[PDB]
DNA sequence: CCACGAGATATAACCTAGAG
DNA sequence: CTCTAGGTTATATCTCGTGG
């Protein structure tokens, strides 16, 4: 219900395998480890979205400001 | 509670300039454009997290999976 | 399930002006 | 007076195979 590691949520999201979350994302199993090994801060949110999407949840990017908040609603990968 | 361009949220705050953000970001006031002229999807989760901090905001990334959600928290200086 | 080697383009970056 | 847009350089993010 709070995590620093993408792999750690996949384990929380049933028996999701690294080669299955690879398969739906149209890329290698290699790429996917290099993903959850990667610094998130040095992940493009697209490449992040693509993943959480791959586990069948939707990535909600809020920019808070004391009251005025801003939800970030941008899609369309290459 | 907007949803579109980064410039939009700056604009949306006090009439802050991409100059004195750039400053609080310590990069050119060029980049800051190339940021808001960019495709979010192809931007580093921190790039944003940085921009949004600079506007006195707190970037909040959730990956919600129906009933439960996972707030992403990965913070240790580059 | 990670490294081992291999290799794109473009993200993140500069400064110096040029369009709005 | 503010942003976009030349003109350049590059570190690593994003890709891949196959084999620790």
Numbering used by the authors:
A (entry chain B), B (entry chain A): 36 to 113
Q: What did the authors write?
A:
Mycobacterium tuberculosis, the causative pathogen of tuberculosis (TB), has three HigBA type II TA systems with reverse gene organization, consisting of the toxin protein HigB and labile antitoxin protein HigA. We studied the MtHigA3 type II TA system protein, a cognate antitoxin of the MtHigB3 ribonuclease toxin. MtHigA3 is predicted to be a transcriptional regulator that autoregulates the higBA3 operon by binding to the operator as an antitoxin itself or via complex formation with the toxin MtHigB3, similar to other type II TA systems. The MtHigA3 antitoxin structure is a homodimer that contains a structurally well conserved DNA-binding domain at the N-terminus and a dimerization domain at the C-terminus.
MtHigA3 bound to DNA was found to crystallize in space group C2 with the MtHigA3 homodimer and 20 bp dsDNA in the asymmetric unit. The electron-density map of the N-terminal 35 amino acids of MtHigA3 bound to DNA was missing, probably due to protease activity. The whole topology of MtHigA3 bound to DNA is similar to that of the MtHigA3 dimer. The overall structures of the MtHigA3 dimer and MtHigA3 bound to DNA are very similar (0.81 Å r.m.s.d. for 78 corresponding Cα atoms of chain A) [Fig. 4(a)]. The interactions between DNA and the MtHigA3 dimer occur mainly through HTH motifs. The recognition α3-helix is inserted in the major groove, and the α2 and the loop that links the α2- and α3-helices support the contacts with the DNA backbone. Interestingly, unusual bending of DNA was observed in MtHigA3 bound to DNA. The DNA fragment bends towards the minor groove with an overall bending angle of 46.5°, as calculated by the CURVES server [Fig. 4(b)]. The average width of the minor groove in canonical B-DNA is 6 Å, but in the structure of MtHigA3 bound to DNA, the width of the minor groove at the A-tract region (bases 9–12) located at the centre of the DNA is narrow (∼3.7 Å). The distance measured from Q64 of each monomer on the α3-helix was increased by 1.9 Å in the MtHigA3 bound to DNA compared with the MtHigA3 dimer (from 37.3 Å to 39.2 Å). The results suggest that rearrangement of the dimer structure is required for DNA binding, providing a wider space between the HTH motifs of each monomer.
